[PDB]
Scaffold this active site. Sequence first.
Site, PDB file in Angstrom:
ATOM      1  N   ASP B  34       0.886  -1.219   0.019  1.00 52.31           N
ATOM      2  CA  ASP B  34       0.043  -0.102   0.019  1.00 52.31           C
ATOM      3  C   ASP B  34       0.756   1.033   0.002  1.00 52.31           C
ATOM      4  O   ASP B  34       1.752   1.613   0.851  1.00 52.31           O
ATOM      5  CB  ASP B  34      -0.931  -0.067   1.469  1.00 52.31           C
ATOM      6  CG  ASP B  34      -1.917   1.077   1.152  1.00 52.31           C
ATOM      7  OD1 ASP B  34      -2.224   1.793   0.181  1.00 52.31           O
ATOM      8  OD2 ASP B  34      -2.391   1.622   2.350  1.00 52.31           O
ATOM      9  N   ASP B 230      -2.258   5.616  -5.238  1.00 54.44           N
ATOM     10  CA  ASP B 230      -2.484   4.733  -4.152  1.00 54.44           C
ATOM     11  C   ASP B 230      -2.602   3.457  -4.709  1.00 54.44           C
ATOM     12  O   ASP B 230      -3.735   3.370  -5.405  1.00 54.44           O
ATOM     13  CB  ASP B 230      -3.820   5.240  -3.337  1.00 54.44           C
ATOM     14  CG  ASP B 230      -4.004   4.187  -2.065  1.00 54.44           C
ATOM     15  OD1 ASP B 230      -3.301   3.244  -1.999  1.00 54.44           O
ATOM     16  OD2 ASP B 230      -4.829   4.422  -1.411  1.00 54.44           O
TER      17      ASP B 230
END
Lengths: 4, 388
Positions: B34, B230
Amino acid sequence: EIAX
Amino acid sequence: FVEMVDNLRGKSGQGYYVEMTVGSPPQTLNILVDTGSSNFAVGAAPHPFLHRYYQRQLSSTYRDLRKGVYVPYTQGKWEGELGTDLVSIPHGPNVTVRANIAAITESDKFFINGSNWEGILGLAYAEIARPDDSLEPFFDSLVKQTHVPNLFSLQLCGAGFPLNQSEVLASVGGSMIIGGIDHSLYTGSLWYTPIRREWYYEVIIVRVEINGQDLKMDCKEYNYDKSIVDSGTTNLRLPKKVFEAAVKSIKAASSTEKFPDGFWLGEQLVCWQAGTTPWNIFPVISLYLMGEVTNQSFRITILPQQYLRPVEDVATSQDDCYKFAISQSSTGTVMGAVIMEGFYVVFDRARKRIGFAVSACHVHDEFRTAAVEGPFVTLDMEDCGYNI
């Protein structure tokens, strides 16, 4: 989904 | 660098994970990658959705900070116990380092069934770590304790049609290269845009066009309040004004066909007799990002295949079924996985810029190509960034  | 190719696995739906080993002796674990969070964290306790978890009891080296932490994600949340232990990536560079780890004890909606990933890696910067910056996010550790260059690059490859968790294990989706760029990965020339602030991988978007049509919204609008890259997030999320704008624009292009206005939200999927899917109706969206030069910028283009996402059969018959990958957001734009699947994306932390290039593994429409193109002229780009 992924939500980061 | 070849050592690191193809390490990753996963899909946009459930995230792409990489294999790491933690503690001594080492315990294998699969960790979500992430860039939306800077917090490294793992399951230290039995859970229904977890095959394996971190047992500190076995780590000889597990060190405890005698602290507790809670982590917030737009979707999951978890709180845990801070500690430090030796950590490594088998399929990464050949080094081992001691880094903060959080053993998750209570979670909500964090873990995903059959995700096959039991941990999360936040590669974002410190400012957004928890409880506070003080706590060093992992990558920084890696860099600090080693000779690894301060960059990593991500190629995320996405399936044609829905992939089973068991299938995903067989299946491979991506390569994460650490302190590197591996040229084989991509084609053409990387184009780089600056990192506005080192917290999320924030970026400024200056123009947006769909099928060559410029929304001609105010550029601030796009970046309200921020645009961040992201891999955490499955779907491309746009602030309300912007989102509504696209949707109207998209619907028009696709008008010919009937979609429940429910679909556009993206709650419910749409099915087509296998192989008949009419992409052509669907628009291609170009996002223009800040140049690294005065009054310069470049754009990357998204095929629908990008934001329209395959999901598996609702009935025991095969019609390719897809879901709408674009989501309204009130936290600014997020360029999620579907966007990042197209391209070999480089996070040049050292040079504080992020660079995009066409992914080698890029999905095919005979008639259109996802591409990254430059250079372009945009004026008063900064004015585009947002300030309260």
